């Protein structure tokens, strides 16, 4: 088709969407940014959703996250490690790569469940207790989440 698909993506972390119009068979990289400030991430719960009527889910990933698991079925992921992941600057924390199939307008969503953030407790190398922020719990995001993170949901031609 010569008609286009406008993929619009959200996130209950992100405060604002990210766009882009392509054309039919084109491969998008659909990803959400974190930055974790002078913190960096403990633990995460996720999934995305996306219509399979218009798009076709070919690669979903954690790019930072070596030992996250994504479960493909459920198109969702987690990980957890007391020794952190450095989102400092803002990284990648999800990224779905999509062939576009049918056209319209459609919404691809990051739904992070729960977010855990720390510090490294210098004498151990690992998480501080005190230092743990609870940006997200069972969905419930903290009322001073965006002193903690910033975050942004990008939608790009795949390269
Ligand atoms: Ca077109
Ligand atoms: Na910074």
């Given at each position: 088709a010569v008609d286009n698909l406008t993929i619009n993506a959200t996130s209950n972390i992100c405060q604002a969407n990210g766009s882009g119009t392509f054309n039919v068979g084109d491969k998008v990289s659909v990803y959400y940014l974190l930055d974790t400030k002078d913190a960096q991430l403990e633990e995460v719960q996720w999934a995305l959703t996306y219509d399979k009527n218009l798009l076709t889910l070919d690669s979903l990933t954690?790019?930072?996250?070596?030992?996250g698991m994504v479960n493909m079925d459920d198109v969702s992921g987690n990980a957890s490690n007391l020794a952190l992941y450095d989102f400092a600057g803002g990284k990648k924390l999800v990224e779905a790569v999509f062939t576009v199939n049918g056209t319209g307008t459609t919404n691809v969503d990051l739904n992070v469940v729960d977010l855990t953030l720390g510090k490294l407790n210098p004498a151990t190398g690992t998480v501080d207790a005190d230092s743990?922020?609870?940006?997200?719990?069972n969905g419930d995001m903290a009322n001073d989440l965006f002193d903690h993170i910033n975050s942004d949901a990008k939608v790009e031609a795949y390269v």
């Open positions: 954690m790019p930072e996250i070596a030992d743990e922020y609870e940006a997200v719990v």
